[PDB]
């Protein structure tokens, strides 16, 4: 009775307004704050194209845009129907890839792509999605990680690994490509730059555990209780106040993001203060075209 | 006339028949989009309609090939008493406490109070951050509150001679601007001037904001979208890659790992032209071991 | 001539044992004057100086009616009349640990028991550190030390007549590789910082006012008439509103404790609200918070 | 005869003038240049008030400015009289905050507050005196460290911890609270960005040795001889140039910490600087009203 | 068992280096592999002012050496005096004065000359390993100490012999830091407390220990330390050289400021470069007319 | 009309295989010259300009008796007058992987074994990291890498009548992404810096000294008198706290780099003190070190 399967048909319902999807697909919980969003092209290891990039973009946005969502899972499904191998991501669509970038194509090959069109490199736009969204982001890593699918793990707030299946591997080099950004950068603020310098120089598999060890997958979990250990770690992450948690995410975000870290960090700042007597009555003076009188409120130190 | 819109030299854009609060054209000729605030009874006051309208024409611009340049601006004068305006900030009429509100009409009473606030002009301030094309400002008479913070995140800005009036004035209605409005402005006029701005809230002319370092250039009121139209023609006889990796190298540090995504984002574009990359993708199709021999080592 | 009122200030509790630094507090302004006072040796500061000046802007920082702080120093001169804002550490008690408490005014009485102290950084940071606003004044001579205080002000105003700014630190083997250097250049820029430093030249006000270092220019006998005018100009608007400011200036550039101060008004902010209050509510109760009411923004 | 508590009477001796500390504890050891500083409200875990926070600061500043004392060792006292528990630090005294943060009270109760005195945040003053102090403090965790108790044990240049009684726990956002400085960003620094943000969205509690593994703990210790290693270690710390001890703690500080790390290291530059006979010319020649002569100080490259 | 990590047989010595004295210099016999080595096993491979000045050099040349993508760093050994083996004991005491580590004609303080100015170059060295376009791997063989210790920091990878390196930073010990690479770098890999700790109490630590501290890649038997070298080389340039290059670039950028920005950038206009786009701003500049750029499109 | 003092200045013992580069060492001061030696291309340089660039900038920042580097371009033109410090890299032998060793001066005496090379990025960090001044005197057009290498040097003086400044990169092609562009924003702003690149407008010295990226104007004949005369003020000072503004003022922006500079100075300011020595002795003396003289100072 053991499931080859992390998913649980019956905890997940589709969200309304999505019956287009095609390379991904997109579930809230029947019970929780908490959505699931997963590539859907297990025959090649999960890799996205350009179209796979729109959904991507679109479903994480909306999920964003969710007052009654705390939490993402973004994991992979599977398995391959061609050799059941499990992947969470494996990057760009070789396919498609052309001297312009990752190009749209009519099918899904090289034969097919619309050469009147520039290619894009446009998963990074889904990666500062990720990055400044005020909610928690958790990558379930249900197999391959690879490519760019291995620098979406990293951008993700939180990793929860399969331990039979979740593989990571870092193959950017071995196609010529390089993620320069979050997947190299900030991989080393999370496992330090001696380890973080060997998986991009080498390219090596690593288990879960080796990540887990390395500093870059919080924790290990039975492949057929991946989403389910996820649903808990979304749980308690829900458990808390969300603006406490929202102000957390842009505290860790702000000096490595520079100005763009400050200017998400102040913008959750600048609501605060909004929600005050004192920037009401600044609103209201304007209004009334008065003088406004801030005798009410102390100069705190 | 003293109006800087010269109507025969724009064109409406494909898809955009619905705009309310935000003007969009296409000049006829060259590769330069003009986007304006479209509110001048209220000094070009942002509400959160305008922000969506704002964010989707930008976004459009950004994605179109054939443009190089953006004009930002505000349309006038006021139909009430002549006030010209860039930008007054955001709508306080519609201001709550969870932040500027969604409303059916343009007052209080028709705010949707079962919709939450939003402050998502940053979205769009990180849209002309982030966009691989130059924005330039043209300030055609009052930049204040937000409307101030847009100005100072475009790329360059050009300035009304007779009407443009900068003024600070989050602080006087108890809001800041805690990210590119303040600290990126310490990064154009200094700190000791950004503070002045912010803390003081004074009325500042163009000629005084172009001595402080905040404004490229001043131009005649009348000729304001016309210099714009010279500066952008001047941009877009240049190598268009050369200008992308400029502006986000421009970005780069500021920006920490935001600004390093971004360059290195087009790194690897320009890798992804070399047969050295070619050959990557073609060993890993063919399942076959890559021949990198060809490609010597630089230093 | 000179810039200070003696009818628009009175004195402060608790200072009346100041001897190197006086203290004033506006009759009618939420503005104190904190001003130098050893204007025989160009307001040169000792170790007990910078202590008194930490004291008093201490005092100042955590006096709810203060909202601006003008720093200056009394002048001038009685020996030669010459004015001075500060001149910067006072090389007569200086020695190899640094400067050194003495019970006089020359090295004959310094404590040999007592090693030497930079501490005026201590000053620097109290100053960048206080969510007030603190402006310049400069009456006269800025140098070496003095110098690097007016650059760490927020915002400086300089007497046209008489306002002097001089780097002299490498002058006298000295200098400030901290706010003095580099946060100038974060106001004139690199090259015009560097000049300043590398060069040592005297700067008018207007010089420093055209190169982004100082504010504004006034006239000698205003100078203090004008501080109090923008004084007021920043008192008159949300006081929230200018502490996170301040902060939002300073954040990056002061890293980690720029990010720290910020935050920490960013989480004062939180404790405000009703959904802040539930959780310290539901923890005396010893019971589950409840977290429905409060939406998620975005 | 295994002591339940670390403290050893014997080997320390009260300060000189701190006779009405409340709050605290303040020893210096009776041999060594160490000095103990303790939270003294076991309680109620060892929580601070703002008359804590007074306390501690007065007293950190106090070994700061003391020559001969090299290290301080930070800690709790306890255990609990009510239950036996034992804790670093719980962080903020819930009981007496309020709006504007934490309030002095004239009793322990939220009911004998000051109203008409506004709330505090100024442990971040405290933090602020640690990460600026040019001596090593070493973080003894001897029980519980949850919220700013946490964050205080973060900023900390060293921390070793209880086998049996440490429990850490990030508790901010279960109150609504958040710490978006050290206790946080800082924390990343220690041990990654996705352990750094597990441990403050789900707010788990973890052992000394799962700190150790993640890098926030340096080491575990019984608890018995918790005081006793941090002593060896602080002998260690003590046997070295002083000299070089601290320009390596404003070095470690110093590109985190953006101008405010420069200032602190390039200070310690200049007064390096000022032992130089160049400098003593400089000096000299300023005081003589003639020209200095550079001619016997030769170009370093 | 051999006791020695270095293969004779898989070693050629590099043409044009038969003055070295305190570095050996080694091209692999099949691979683009340099093996750059300390040879001063006699007092733990302490380094004075010559030996940087040489590991400069050598260095440099193989950044030079286009056929050439992996550096291996290590010691020679043992020393022939008790055995005892080392990577790299740092600055040599012997000659260090006030004014830095000084030139000297033997190997003693009294040989030092007196007429010139000390130094403390081993921080160049330091950032030609940094700035070079290839990956540097440190093998630590034996003592990795004080200056030593930062060297192994630097690098891009390190490999450490389970028997045999022992890590220790003496520096405080002998009143001096390397406030730099060494110090605030190693808290880049094994984070702000375990860092401090290091150089704070200075205690040896093993293979394993900085392996699950992070500064170290990984432990290999001692006899196998350098196959095991060549071996992660291989991986390495088995790779696209230009990617790796990028990458390289990369993971320094921000944690070097405007020097990483400046290396990284220039990279990319080298891929500029590469262009057709590039070859017509030249080709119109060459022939005095304006640039057509209308075939090559804006992306986005 | 020339800039040139031919009285003023020595050659070099060592580099009269000198070709693309003239050196100088002043007859009396602490000051060397600098400068681009192929007037006939407006001074652009090819590889082997880089090389001996390096050399000569290497040399002095190894010559003690030298603070100052004066760094600029020989003129006029002998073809048509006109005056340049430097127009960037030689167009004649860029390749698409960089500019290209040449037996000659044009691509068909290229040497295709040999890859092009960028390596003008070298001399921006020898310029960056040299414990000294280096100040370019920009004499004529400053265009492209030119450009760039005027805006790393620590001080500019310009040429009231021929200097120009003109960021020609994106006209080519071209980009200078680090110090040409960004660090030209920390000396005249975010928005001039993006203006001089974009549009790529040609500056007079004036202008771009109202901007902030140039210290002084001088007349053209003066400009080298006026560059020894800044140069003389410079080494008037404390070469010691000279070398450390230096790195402090580098410091924050270069990040690590930076650190490792200024941190690489204040270790050798450490190991003149008797406690680093006693550290060193007792190491070499196989016994503890006694650190009991030597106070902890706050
Ligand atoms: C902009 C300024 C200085 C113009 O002065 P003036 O020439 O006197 O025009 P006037 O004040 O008479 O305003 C003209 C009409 O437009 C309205 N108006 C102008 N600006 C408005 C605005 N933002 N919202 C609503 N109505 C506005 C006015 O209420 C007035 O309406 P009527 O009298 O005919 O009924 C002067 O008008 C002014 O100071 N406006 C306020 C600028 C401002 O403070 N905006 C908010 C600051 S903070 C901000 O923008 C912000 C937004 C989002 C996130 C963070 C932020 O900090
Ligand atoms: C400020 C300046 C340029 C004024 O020159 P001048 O107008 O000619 O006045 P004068 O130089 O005659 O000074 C008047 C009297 O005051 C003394 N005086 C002035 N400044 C003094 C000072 N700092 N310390 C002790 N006595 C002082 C003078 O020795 C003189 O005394 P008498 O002849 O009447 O007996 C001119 O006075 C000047 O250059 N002063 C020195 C500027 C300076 O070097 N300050 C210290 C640099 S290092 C520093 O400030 C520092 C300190 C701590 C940490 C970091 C730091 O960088
Ligand atoms: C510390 C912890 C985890 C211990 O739990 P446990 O071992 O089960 O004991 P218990 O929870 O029963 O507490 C024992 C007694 O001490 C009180 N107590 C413990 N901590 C207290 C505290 N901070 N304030 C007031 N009373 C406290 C308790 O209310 C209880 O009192 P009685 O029932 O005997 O009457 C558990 O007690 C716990 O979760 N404590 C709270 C940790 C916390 O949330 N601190 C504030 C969070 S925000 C913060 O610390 C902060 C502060 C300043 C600036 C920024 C900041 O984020
Ligand atoms: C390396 C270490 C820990 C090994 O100790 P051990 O295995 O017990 O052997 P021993 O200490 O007896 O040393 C073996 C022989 O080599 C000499 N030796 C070893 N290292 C030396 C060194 N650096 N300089 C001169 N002679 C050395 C020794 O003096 C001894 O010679 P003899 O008694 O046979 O005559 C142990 O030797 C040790 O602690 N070495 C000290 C490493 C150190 O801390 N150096 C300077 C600190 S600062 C630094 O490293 C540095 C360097 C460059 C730039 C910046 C920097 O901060």
Avoid at 6 to 29: C, E, M, Q, S
Avoid at 240 to 268: I, T, W, Y
Avoid at 278 to 290: P, W
Wanted: hydrophobic share 40%; charged share 25%.
């Amino acid at each position: 009775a053991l499931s080859d399967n992390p998913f649980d048909a019956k905890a997940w319902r589709l969200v309304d307004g999505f019956d287009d999807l095609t390379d991904i697909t997109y579930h809230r919980h029947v019970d929780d704050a908490t959505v699931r969003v997963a590539f859907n092209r297990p025959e090649v290891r999960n890799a996205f194209r350009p179209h796979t990039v729109d959904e991507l973009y679109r479903v994480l946005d909306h999920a964003r845009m969710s007052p009654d969502v705390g939490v993402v899972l973004l994991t992979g499904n599977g398995p391959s129907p061609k050799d059941g191998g499990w992947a969470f991501c494996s990057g760009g669509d070789q396919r498609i890839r052309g001297r312009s970038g990752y190009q749209y194509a009519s099918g899904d090959t090289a034969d097919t792509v619309d050469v009147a069109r520039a290619g894009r490199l446009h998963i990074l736009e889904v990666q500062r999605l990720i990055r400044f969204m005020p909610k928690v982001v958790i990558c379930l890593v249900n197999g391959w990680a690879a490519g760019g699918g291995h620098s979406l793990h990293v951008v993700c707030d939180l990793t929860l690994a399969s331990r039979e299946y979740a593989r990571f591997k870092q193959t950017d080099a071995d196609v010529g490509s390089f993620d320069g950004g979050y997947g190299s950068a900030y991989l080393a603020r999370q496992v330090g730059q001696k380890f973080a310098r060997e998986i991009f120089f080498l390219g090596r598999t690593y288990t879960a555990e080796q990540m887990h060890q390395m500093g870059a997958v919080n924790a290990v979990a039975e492949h057929a209780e991946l989403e389910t250990v996820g649903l808990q770690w979304a749980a308690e992450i829900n458990a808390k106040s969300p603006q406490a948690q929202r102000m957390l995410k842009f505290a860790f975000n702000l000096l490595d993001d520079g100005l763009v870290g400050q200017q998400l960090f102040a913008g959750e700042a600048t609501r605060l203060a909004y929600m005050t007597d004192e920037a009401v009555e600044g609103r209201d003076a304007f209004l009334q075209k008065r003088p406004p009188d801030w005798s009410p409120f102390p100069r705190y130190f």
